[PDB]
Design a protein around this ligand. Structure first.
Ligand SMILES: O=C(NCc1ccc2ncccc2c1)c1cc(Br)ccc1O
Ligand SMILES: [Zn+2]
Length: 351
């Protein structure tokens, strides 16, 4: 049935909702950094993505790991697609006052991410010590750009994002195919919202970031406008996504000593999930009574994605998250066997 799945969801819920001093420490540090950053010539317009977002948790199993985004608005941005990759871009400028705030990171016409991250980090690294023990790490880098450690238990990833309030880039034109589930008029409202760019390479390239659209969908996710508001209309969409996320996290934990699962992340799980939401648009296909079957649909579909090596980005249709140049055949084959073993054994990572 669903009894074991429900107990896992309850355990995860109680440790999320449990009273904790962690959010208070995170806010104190974040507000510290933002007052310092706003005084610099380059970052005077920096601010938190969401107010009330001192507590975004990418890892559903680790309530002490926090994800925060700092945004900077770039008016009249010029995007140049990098190397037909559809999702990666150079950032240039229209330069109305050619001494725009980010002029100091220009290299020719192209905005240097690594230079901008350099000053961002250095400014945070000096402000860190001038209350609590805050330590940072220069490891990996990219996005998350800056990782802080509050006390011993609590970690905070800080990602710097550029914000543009112009129309989404053309690679997204045929994406976000929610018309038969959330409706065409909601797709239009969503695509009027700004988009974000975060640093990453496949050089000085940036990629589109849609976490804010994901959050909007998840908070208003039914075909019915009253889905999950009360009574006879309680669905299991959010629970299926939580269980998918926890499955991958537990598997990456179990096999961290091997390297094969290193490239997989919640992006792959979230993307496959929203594809199943498109496949199954009716709220009656997500009945709370059917949690077991619905989670199994999600698992089946994800496994189908691994075997065919095809997982189309939910926002950029021509971008295959599972292309062999991104994740090789042997790694997808390894995750396939591990998930099939979980499924055929009433999921032992949920013990
Ligand atoms: O698809 C997304 N963003 C674009 C993108 C492009 C290439 C990538 N390559 C590797 C890793 C992550 C990648 C993300 C997205 C989807 C959801 Br649901 C929530 C937030 C998102 O940002
Ligand atoms: Zn619902």
């Amino acid at each position: 049935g669903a009894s074991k799945l429900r107990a896992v969801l309850e355990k995860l819920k109680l440790s999320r909702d449990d009273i904790s001093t962690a959010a208070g420490m995170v806010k104190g540090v974040v507000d510290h950094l933002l007052l310092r950053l706003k005084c610099d010539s380059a970052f005077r317009g920096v601010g938190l993505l969401n107010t009330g977002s001192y507590y975004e948790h990418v890892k559903i199993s680790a309530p002490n790991e926090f994800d925060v985004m700092f945004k900077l608005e770039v008016p009249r941005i010029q995007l140049e697609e990098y190397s037909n990759t559809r999702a990666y871009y150079f950032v240039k400028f229209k330069r109305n006052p050619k001494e725009n705030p980010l002029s100091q990171f220009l290299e020719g016409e192209i905005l240097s991410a690594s230079k901008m991250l350099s000053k961002f980090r250095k400014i945070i690294k000096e402000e860190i010590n001038d209350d609590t023990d805050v330590i940072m790490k220069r490891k990996r880098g990219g996005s998350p750009a800056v990782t802080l450690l509050i006390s011993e238990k609590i970690s905070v990833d800080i990602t710097l994002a550029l914000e543009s309030k112009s129309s989404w880039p053309a690679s997204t034109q045929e994406g976000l195919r929610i018309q038969n589930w959330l409706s065409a008029k909601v797709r239009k409202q969503l695509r009027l919202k700004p988009f974000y760019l975060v640093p990453k390479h496949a050089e000085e390239t940036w990629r589109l970031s849609f976490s804010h659209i994901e959050k909007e969908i998840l908070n208003n996710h039914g075909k019915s406008k009253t889905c999950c508001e009360n009574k006879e209309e309680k669905c299991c969409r959010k629970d299926c996504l939580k269980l998918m996320k926890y499955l991958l996290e537990q598997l990456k934990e179990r096999f961290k000593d091997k390297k094969h699962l290193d490239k997989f992340s919640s992006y792959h799980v979230k993307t496959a999930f929203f594809h199943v939401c498109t496949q199954n648009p009716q709220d009656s296909q997500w009945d709370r009574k059917d949690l077991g079957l619905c989670f199994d649909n999600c698992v089946t579909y994800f496994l189908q994605c691994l075997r065919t090596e095809k997982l189309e980005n939910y926002f950029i249709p021509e971008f295959n998250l599972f292309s062999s140049n991104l994740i090789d055949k042997r790694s997808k084959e390894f995750l396939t066997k591990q998930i099939e073993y979980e499924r055929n054994n009433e999921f032992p990572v949920f013990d």
